[PDB]
Amino acid sequence: GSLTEDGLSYKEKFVVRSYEVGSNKTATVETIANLLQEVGCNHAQSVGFATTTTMRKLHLIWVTARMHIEIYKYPAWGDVVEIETWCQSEGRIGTRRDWILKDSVTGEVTGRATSKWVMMNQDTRRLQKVSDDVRDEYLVFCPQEPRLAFPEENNRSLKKIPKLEDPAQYSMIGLKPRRADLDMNQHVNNVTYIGWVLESIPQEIVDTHELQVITLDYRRECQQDDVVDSLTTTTSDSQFLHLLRLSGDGQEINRGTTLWRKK
Amino acid sequence: GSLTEDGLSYKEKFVVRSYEVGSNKTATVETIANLLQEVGCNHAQSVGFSATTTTMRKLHLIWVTARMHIEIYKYPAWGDVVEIETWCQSEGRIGTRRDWILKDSVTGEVTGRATSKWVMMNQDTRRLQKVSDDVRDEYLVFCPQEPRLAFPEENNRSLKKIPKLEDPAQYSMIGLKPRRADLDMNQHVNNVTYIGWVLESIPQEIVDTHELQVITLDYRRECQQDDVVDSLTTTTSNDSQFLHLLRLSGDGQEINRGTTLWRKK
Ligand SMILES: Fc1ccc(NC2CCOCC2)nc1
Ligand SMILES: Fc1ccc(NC2CCOCC2)nc1
Numbered sequence: 001g002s003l004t005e006d007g008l009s010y011k012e013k014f015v016v017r018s019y020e021v022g023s024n025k026t027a028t029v030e031t032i033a034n035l036l037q038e039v040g041c042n043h044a045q046s047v048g049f050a051t052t053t054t055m056r057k058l059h060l061i062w063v064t065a066r067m068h069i070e071i072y073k074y075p076a077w078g079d080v081v082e083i084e085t086w087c088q089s090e091g092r093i094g095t096r097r098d099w100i101l102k103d104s105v106t107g108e109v110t111g112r113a114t115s116k117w118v119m120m121n122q123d124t125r126r127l128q129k130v131s132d133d134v135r136d137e138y139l140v141f142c143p144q145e146p147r148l149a150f151p152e153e154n155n156r157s158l159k160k161i162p163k164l165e166d167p168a169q170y171s172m173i174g175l176k177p178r179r180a181d182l183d184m185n186q187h188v189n190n191v192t193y194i195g196w197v198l199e200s201i202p203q204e205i206v207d208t209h210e211l212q213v214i215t216l217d218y219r220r221e222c223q224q225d226d227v228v229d230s231l232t233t234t235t236s237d238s239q240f241l242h243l244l245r246l247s248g249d250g251q252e253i254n255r256g257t258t259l260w261r262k263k
Numbered sequence: 264g265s266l267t268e269d270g271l272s273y274k275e276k277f278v279v280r281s282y283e284v285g286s287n288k289t290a291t292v293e294t295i296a297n298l299l300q301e302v303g304c305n306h307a308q309s310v311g312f313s314a315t316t317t318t319m320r321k322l323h324l325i326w327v328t329a330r331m332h333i334e335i336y337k338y339p340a341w342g343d344v345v346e347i348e349t350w351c352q353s354e355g356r357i358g359t360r361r362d363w364i365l366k367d368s369v370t371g372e373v374t375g376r377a378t379s380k381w382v383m384m385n386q387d388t389r390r391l392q393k394v395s396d397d398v399r400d401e402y403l404v405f406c407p408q409e410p411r412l413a414f415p416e417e418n419n420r421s422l423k424k425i426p427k428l429e430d431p432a433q434y435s436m437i438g439l440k441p442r443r444a445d446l447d448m449n450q451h452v453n454n455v456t457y458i459g460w461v462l463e464s465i466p467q468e469i470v471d472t473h474e475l476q477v478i479t480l481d482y483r484r485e486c487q488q489d490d491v492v493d494s495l496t497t498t499t500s501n502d503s504q505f506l507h508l509l510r511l512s513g514d515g516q517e518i519n520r521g522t523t524l525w526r527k528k
Binding site for chain 1: 280281282284285286288291293297300301304305308341342438439440442443444446447448449450453455459460462463470
């Protein structure tokens with residue numbers, strides 16, 4: 001991979017692997033989500049980071065608040081997908097990371113994604129606004145004019161998500177992470193929550209539809225010793241409302257929505 | 264990736280990804296195992312098995328893993344390039360073998376090696392069977408004719424018999440179940456998931472203070488997408504050795520047995 005000519009964005013090419021595809025021989029949305037985090041990580045490394053010097057001094061880290069992905073075509077096993085990524089400040093609210101996915105052979109846009117990140121103290125887990133000190137440290141690596149993967153006014157990436165009401169239409173209970181679900185810092189990888197959300201969608205929907213859009217809000221982290229319940233209700237194309245909560249006390253960890261198109 | 268000059272083996276380079284590494288910032292043994300299956304798949308495709316032969320498709324036969332044996336000297340770090348070479352060899356009518364050698368791309372040093380035994384099985388009845396002369400002749404033209412072994416040694420750990428763990432187990436992880444990411448393109452549980460499940464019953468303190476050097480896993484029965492598994496481990500031993508057993512949560516039907524060898528960091 002490499003930074004682009006202006007040094008304000010980053011591109012990387014990936015060849016879709018045999019174990020990365022589902023039963024239609026195309027990349028799963030979890031493989032796509034892993035590729036998004038890998039290209040994001042390579043972008044941060046390329047510009048010297050993903051915490052700044054002031055963030056390290058104050059024990060602050062970036063945490064995902066929201067992930068939104070729209071796929072038009074899933075790349076097939078053996079296909080090359082090119083992913084471009086960039087960051088932008090959202091004032092003191094936090095930061096945003098966007099991605100564009102393209103078919104390497106045709107140059108056609110096959111997907112797009114956007115994510116909202118908030119600053120959090122590593123130890124107390126207290127959310128915070130971004131200080132002007134940290135904003136100045138990453139502004140030199142971001143486009144100055146707004147650049148959006150989802151520019152449209154009133155688009156799906158900014159819609160409020162309601163809380164699923166019991167009883168859920170579908171459920172998958174007792175989900176728990178194994179060591180492969182953890183990241184290098186021993187926290188549950190953000191992509192695992194995408195998998196857990198999808199576990200409560202009936203297999204018949206998966207067999208007859210393709211996932212077009214997924215919006216996921218992250219409220220609380222699942223610990224390596226926690227147990228999760230995945231809940232889904234049809235709200236409709238087929239649309240669903242999702243809720244992930246702790247198996248015991250019912251504490252919310254995520255809420256989301258999915259939109260599926262008939263094959 | 265590409266077939267080598269003689270067309271009897273295949274090589275491919277991989278850059279270790281951020282989500283592929285553990286707490287030491289080096290590739291997990293499950294990432295290594297996924298890379299082994301990917302290079303094996305690319306080798307089959309390169310020689311026209313886009314991995315069953317013509318006779319196998321006619322007779323509804325498939326290759327299934329009977330045993331996987333991996334030894335790692337150095338796990339590649341996040342961002343490192345690892346080169347993997349793979350080849351196949353017939354083992355008469357018993358089945359086939361696939362071997363791998365892992366190297367550090369920069370130094371050319373061997374950092375790991377693996378070997379696997381595969382048996383023929385009817386896709387529908389699940390009945391194991393011997394390799395016919397016709398099947399053997401269809402893949403012999405893609406294998407080295409002289410024996411080529413990743414574990415040539417006359418007393419290697421890749422061929423040792425594994426006993427069945429006796430209850431009570433010293434350690435256990437119960438109620439393990441696959442999610443959609445654990446399935447392969449044919450909706451079967453990926454062979455690498457069983458490696459993860461075996462490792463779930465090793466205490467975290469061993470993982471934090473030791474590095475996994477060797478893993479030998481026997482595959483007896485497959486876990487369905489709706490089955491539930493229990494992972495059992497007992498210490499048998501600076502080095503620490505363990506005996507492992509995976510069995511169905513309900514009736515206790517064995518799905519895998521294995522051994523691991525760990526060295527102190
Ligand atoms: F845009 C991103 C997305 C993820 C990331 N880093 C995490 C993903 C890999 O292991 C843990 C750290 N950085 C930037
Ligand atoms: F050498 C090998 C190893 C595994 C494999 N099987 C593949 C079946 C589809 O999912 C990816 C793995 N083929 C060849």
